[PDB]
Nucleic acid binder design. Sequence first.
DNA 1: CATTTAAGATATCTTAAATA
DNA 2: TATTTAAGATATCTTAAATG
Lengths: 66, 66
Amino acid sequence: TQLMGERIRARRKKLKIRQAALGKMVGVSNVAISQWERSETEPNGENLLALSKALQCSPDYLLKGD
Amino acid sequence: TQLMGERIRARRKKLKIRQAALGKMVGVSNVAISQWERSETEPNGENLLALSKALQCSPDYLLKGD
DNA sequence: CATTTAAGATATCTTAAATA
DNA sequence: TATTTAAGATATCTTAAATG
């Protein structure tokens, strides 16, 4: 029952960086990162790809795990 | 420069399928496909990944090309 | 100080009508 | 009849305020 938001936060925690720092890498605000982690919203196409690169994983892993 | 929508339409033409057929494959309406092709909107995260699979290419190719 | 909540503008969809 | 346009619901973002 793992949500994409939980995978996003776990990968950020692995990097040990703040939401604002991850936001800067992706091109969005720290608030957008927070909304994605809490599963309030999901990243759009371009942001999902940028986020996957910053977190060093595939977009599929974030979307549905593995 | 070439827009993502143009790469989407060209790729669809290659597979020889109608917009409605691609929509069924991705899980959206034929109108959504029309909007992406004309650059009226861009696919969201889940939809871009499903679209890349239906068109047999990477999300990166659709987004930025070569 | 990092994050979440609040308020608000634009983006992304759906269905019905219009167009080629 | 394939695709585009129009209207409208709601998702995805923004910056400021509040909370931990």
